[PDB]
Amino acid sequence: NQEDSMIMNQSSIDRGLFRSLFFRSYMDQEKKYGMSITETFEKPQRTNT
Amino acid sequence: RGPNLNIVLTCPECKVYPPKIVERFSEGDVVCALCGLVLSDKLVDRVGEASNPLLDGNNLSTRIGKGETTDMRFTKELNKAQGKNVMDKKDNEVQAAFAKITMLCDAAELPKIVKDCAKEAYKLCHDEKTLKGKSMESIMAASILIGCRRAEVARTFKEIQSLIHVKTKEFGKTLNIMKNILRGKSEDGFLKIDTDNMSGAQNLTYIPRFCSHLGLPMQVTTSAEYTAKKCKEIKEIAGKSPITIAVVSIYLNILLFQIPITAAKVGQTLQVTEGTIKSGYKILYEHRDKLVDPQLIANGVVSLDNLPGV
Amino acid sequence: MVQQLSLFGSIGDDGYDLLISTLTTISGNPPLLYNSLCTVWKPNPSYDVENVNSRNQLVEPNRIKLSKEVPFSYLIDETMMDKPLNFRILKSFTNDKIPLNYAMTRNILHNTESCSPWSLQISDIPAAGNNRSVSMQTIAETIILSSAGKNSSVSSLMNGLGYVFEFQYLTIGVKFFMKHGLILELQKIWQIEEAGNSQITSGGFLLKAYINVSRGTDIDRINYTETALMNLKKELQGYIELSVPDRQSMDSRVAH
Amino acid sequence: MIVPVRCFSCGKVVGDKWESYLNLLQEDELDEGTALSRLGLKRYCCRRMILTHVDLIEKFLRYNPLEKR
Amino acid sequence: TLKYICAECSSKLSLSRTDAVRCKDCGHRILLKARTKRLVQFEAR
Amino acid sequence: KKLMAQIFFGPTYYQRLRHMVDDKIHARARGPMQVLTRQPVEGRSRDGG
Ligand SMILES: [Mg+2]
Ligand SMILES: [Zn+2]
Ligand SMILES: [Zn+2]
Ligand SMILES: [Zn+2]
C-alpha cells in the first residue's frame, strides 16, 4: 500500500464490494448516399460481401 | 485496355487460386490462412475534406476568406477571381441550382434524403437536350417531387405548387421529361427496381400527413389507411385523384369515430371542395362493409350505424 | 516425433533387375520383399467439427492411415508356390490382377474377436522451407496391438474415434538397408476397391529413399542424414534422378 | 440497489434482515441502532451493511416493465 | 419474422425486412428487439 | 500474533473511480500504420503505438 496504493479485501470483492455495471451503447445508421448507394442492415455472407 | 497495375496477392508457396487470405488489422499483417506466411506487412489503415463524386462530380475548389490578419482590399480582388472564371460556368450554375434545391427543401422542412435525391435527380436530368426550354422553377419543382417519391416521402402537386409558383401544365411536362431521362439513365447505368415508388397515386402515403394536419388520432389514421387501401378495389372511385380518395376516406373515418371536424373544415385544411368530399362520402356510403376495418367493429371501438345516411 | 528425410523417383519395369543389381553392389545387402496394406480413414462428414482444438490453435482435418502386413500366401494365387519369395516375384506383378481383393480386405478390417497389429500413421504436408534439398515430412505413429469386445472390429473402433474409411492400397516392394540407416524402398502400389483393383504405379516401380530421425530438432543429425541422401544421389547420377516430389502431392489433408 | 446478500467484511448473511429491519423501523418505532441490535448485527460492518443501504430497487420498479407478459 | 416490443405500449410485433419500423398499435417509432430464446450461462461469482 | 502497533480502524466512505486498469492496459508488437507518415497510429482502441 506504499505510494498511495491500497490493499482491498478479495473476500469483500467476491461478496460485492465496489462491483459495477458498465453499459456501452453503439449507435449505427443506414444512410442513402444516392439512388442505389444505400446502406442496409443485414447478416452478411462471405460469398457475396 | 491500358496497363494492368493490379496487385494480385497470393501465397507463393501454397499456389492456391483463389488464395485464402486473412487481413490481420491489429497485427498490421496480411497472411496466407493455409500456411501462415506473411505476404505483406506494415498495413495502412482528419487531414482533408469530404467530397462525394456523385453529387457535385470530381470538382476540387477552395474559397477565400478572412484570416487572423487580413486586409479587406486583397479579399475583394480575390473573390472576383473565382467569380470571373469561364471554365466552370456550368459548375457554378449547377451549384446555384443545388443551392436553390436546398433552400426550397429547407423552407418546406424536407429531410436530407429528399434533398439528396432531388439534387441527384437534377444532376442526372441536367444538360439534357430534351430539357432545355422548360422553366428553372419547373425543373426545381419536378426534382423535388421526384426526390419525395424516391424517398417515399411523397408530396402532391398542390404541395409543390404551394412552395414553387409554377404553372401546372409545364410542371407536368417537366416531370414526364425528367422521369423519361431518369429511366434512360437507369437503363444506361445501374438498374433500379421501382417497387411502387414513382407511382402517381401513392394514396397510402398521404393519409398520415393529412391526419396530422387535421389532428386525428393514430387509430383513426390507421383506419383511414385501411379504407384508402380498400378503395382501390372499388371500380367507381379508383379513377378519382389520390388526394380526393385519401380525403374522403379520412372524412368517412372521422364520421365513424365521431371526431368533431366538419366537412367544410376538412376541405379548408386539405384544399378539397366540400361538395367533392360530400359526394365521395355519399358514394362510399354504399360500400360501408368492405371499407371499414373489420376488427374495429369486432372490438366495438366503432360501429357502422354511426355513419350518417344519404 | 519422427522426421523422414526422403527422396523419390521412378523406374520402368525393364530396368528393375538392373537397379536391383546396382543397389546390391552399392549396399552389399540383398533386397527384402515386403508388403503393407494401408487403410486410410478420413473424419466423418456427418460429424460437425470445430477448426480449433483443445487448445486455441486452429487445425485442418487430416486423413489418418492404418498400415499392416498381409501374409504372402494371400498374395500367391496358387500358381507360384515353387518360386521363393524374393525380388524376382515383382516382375509378374504388372497388371491390375492381385489376389487380395476388396471382399477379403473388408474381412480383414471387420475381423470376421482379437485384431491383428496395426500401425497408425498421421502425416502432415512437408515443410515449406525452400532451403532443404530433400523432402522433410513429420509423421506421428502408434502401434495398435490388440482389441476385444462385441464391437472389436478396427473399422468400428476407427468410427468410435470418429473416422470413416475412404480408400485403401496394397503396396508390394523390395527394400535395402544400406550404410548408416538409410532405407531405400522400391514398390508397386494397387488401390483396392469393390469395383476392381487398379495398378497406380502403372508399368514401373516407385522409389523412396528415406531416413527416420527421432529428433528433428537435432540439426546436426538432420544435416548428416541430408548429406547421406545427397551422397546417394551423387552415387546414383547418370542412371536415375532423385528429386523432391510436390508438397501438394505429399499432403494428406482433407480439402474443402 | 437491492440489499446485499452478505456483509462485505465478514460474510454474515444480511439479505434476510431487510424487511424485518424496515418493519422494526416503521411499526415498532425503534430507532435504527436498536433495530440493528434486535436483528443481531453486533459488528459495525454488519450494522453499516443494513444502515447505509439505499434501496433503489423500488425507484427502478416505479418504471413500467419494458417486456410485459 | 423477427420479434420486437414497442417502447411504451409494450406490444409484441413481428417484423420482416420490407416492413417499416413503427408500432402498429399506437404508432410509436421506437421498438426493442426481443430477448433471445436460448439459455444464457452466467457464473454465479 | 498480535501486531505490536494498534491500528486506526473503522468505516470510511470510498468512491470507485472510473479509471480501471483494463481500460488503460495497452501493448503493441506490430500493428496498423498511419496513412500519411506510416508510423504507428494513436489510441489503444486502434491497436496503436
Ligand atoms: Mg501520481
Ligand atoms: Zn500459403
Ligand atoms: Zn459483517
Ligand atoms: Zn406501441
Q: Residues near E9 by Cβ (< 8 Å), separated by ≥ 6?
A: E23, E25, E26, E28
In chain B, helix, strand, coil percent, each to 5?
Answer: 55, 5, 45
Q: Cβ separation of B25 and F33 shorter than 8 Å?
A: no
Flag whether B touches E (3+ CB pairs, 8 A cutoff).
yes
Give the method used. cryo-EM
Q: What is the CB neighbour count within 10 angstroms for residue B113? A: 18
The helix (H) or strand (E) run that includes residue B96 is: helix B89-107
Taking residue B283's Cβ as centre, other Cβ atoms within 10 Å add up to: 15
Delineate the domains of chain D, giving CATH numbers in brackets: 1-66 (1.10.10.60)
Q: What is the Cα–Cα distance from D62 to A37, expressed in whole angstroms?
A: 45
**How far from each other are the two terminal CA atoms of chain C, in whole angstroms?**
28
For residue B146, which of B127, B118, B124 has the smallest C-alpha distance? B118
Which residue is listed with cell 492496459? F25
Distance from C-alpha of B44 to C-alpha of F10, rounded to nearest angstrom: 56
Return the C-alpha cell found at C60.
485442418
Cα C199–chain centre separation = 15
Domain extent, residue B283, equals: 203-299
- Residue D63 touches partner E, C-beta closer than 8 Å: no
CATH of the domain at B294: 1.10.472.10
The rounded distance, in Å, linking the Cα atoms of C191 and C172 is: 12
Give the domain CATH number at E39. 2.20.28.30
Cell (9 digits) for C87: 525380388
Gap sites in chain B (C to N > 2.5 Å), preceding residue numbers = 45
What is the arrangement of strands in the sheet containing B21-24, beginning at the earlier edge strand? B21-24, B29-32, B38-41
Considering its fold, how many domains does chain E have in total?
1
Residues of chain D contacting A16 with CB distance shorter than 8 Å:
4-6, 8
Chain A nearest CA to D7, separation (Å) = 7
d(CA B280, CA B234): 12
CA dihedral B185, B187, B192, B198 (to 10 degrees): 70
How many Å from the N-terminal Cα to the C-terminal Cα in chain A? Answer: 54
Q: Which residues pair with C35 in a beta bridge?
A: C172
The answer to whether the beta carbons of residues C193 and C222 sit under 8 Å apart is: no
Q: What's the rounded Cα separation, in Å, for the pair C23 and C29?
A: 8
Work out the angle at residue B82's Cα, subtended by the Cα atoms of residues B78 and B86, and round it to the nearest 5 degrees: 140
Contact in structure between C216 and C3 (CB atoms under 8 Å): yes
Q: Which residue has the cell 530433400?
A: C134
How many of the other CB atoms lie within 10 Å of CB of C62?
17
Let me know: does C125 contact C4? Beta carbons within 8 Å. Answer: no
Buried b (16+ CB within 10 A) or exposed e, E2-34: eebbbeeebbebebeeeeeeebeebeeeebeee
Instruction: Provide, as residue numbers in chain B, all residues whose Cβ is less than 8 Å from the Cβ of A36.
Output: 190, 192
Residues in chain F: 49
Resolution in A: 3.0
Q: Is the Cβ of C128 closer than 8 Å to some Cβ of chain B?
A: yes
Secondary structure letter of residue E12 according to DSSP? E
C-alpha cell at F2: 498480535
DSSP C133-160: SSEEEEEEEEEE----STT--HHHHHHH
Count other Cβ atoms within 10 Å, centred on residue F37: 8
CB atoms within 10 A of CB C94: 14
The CA distance from B41 to B23, in Å, is 10
Residue with cell string 398521404: B206
Q: How far is CA B291 from the centre of its chain?
A: 30
Question: In residues, how long is chain A?
Answer: 49
Sign of the alpha-carbon torsion through C72, C75, C79, C84? negative
Q: What count of Cα atoms within 13 Å lies in the side-chain half-sphere of residue D32?
A: 9
With a CB-CB cutoff of 8 Å, which residues 6-25 of chain A face chain D? 9, 11-12, 15-17
Q: Which of C84, C100, C94 is nearest to C16 (CA)?
A: C94
Say if residue C245 is preceded by a cis peptide, omega within 30 of 0. no
**Kind and range of the H or E element at B76?**
helix B72-83
The domain containing residue E13 runs over which residues?
3-45
The upper half-sphere exposure of residue C23, i.e. CA atoms within 13 Å in the direction of its Cβ, equals 26
Separation of CA C66 and ligand 2 centre (Å): 29
Cβ within 8 Å of residue D59, ≥6 positions away: none
End-to-end CA distance of chain E: 37
Measured between alpha carbons, how far apart are the two ends of chain F, in Å? 50
Whether residue C207 contacts residue C9, with contact meaning beta carbons closer than 8 Å, is answered with yes
| Contact assessment for residue C204 and residue C14, using Cβ atoms and an 8 Å cutoff | no
Of B94, B87, B89, B101, nearest to B57 (Cα)?
B94
F21, with CB counted inside 10 A (0-12, 13-18, 19+), is exposed
Torsion-angle region of B203 (φ positive above 0: left; ψ -120 to 50: alpha; else: beta): alpha
| Residues, beta carbon < 5 Å, ion ligand 3 | D 7, 9-10, 12, 43, 45-46
D7 is in an annotated binding site: yes
At B15, which amino acid appears? K
- Annotate chain C with DSSP letters as a single string: -EEEEEEEEEEESTTHHHHHHHHHHHHSS--EEEEEEEEEEEE-TTS---SB-SSS-B---B-EEEEE---TTTTS-SS-SSS-SSGGGGGT--SS--S--HHHHHHHHHT------EEEEEE-PPP--TT-SSEEEEEEEEEE----STT--HHHHHHHHTEEEEEEEEEEEEEEEETTTEEEEEEEEEE--TT--EESSTTEEEEEEEEEES-TT-HHHHHHHHHHHHHHHHHHTTT---BPPPHHHH--BPP-
In terms of Cβ atoms closer than 10 Å to its own Cβ (0-12, 13-18, 19+), residue B309 is exposed
Give the active site residues of A. Answer: 4
Angle at B52 between CA B50 and CA B56, to 5 degrees: 115
Residue F26 touches partner B, C-beta closer than 8 Å: no
Separation of alpha carbons E40 and D61, rounded Å: 24
- Nearest Cα neighbor of B280 from B229, B243, B306, B305 is B243
Contact A9 D11 (CB under 8 A): no
- For chain B, strand residue ranges (E) read 21-24, 29-32, 38-41
D45 vs F contacts (CB less than 8 Å):
11
Bridge-based pairing state of the strands C204-213 and C182-191: antiparallel
Residues pairing with C199 in the sheet: C190
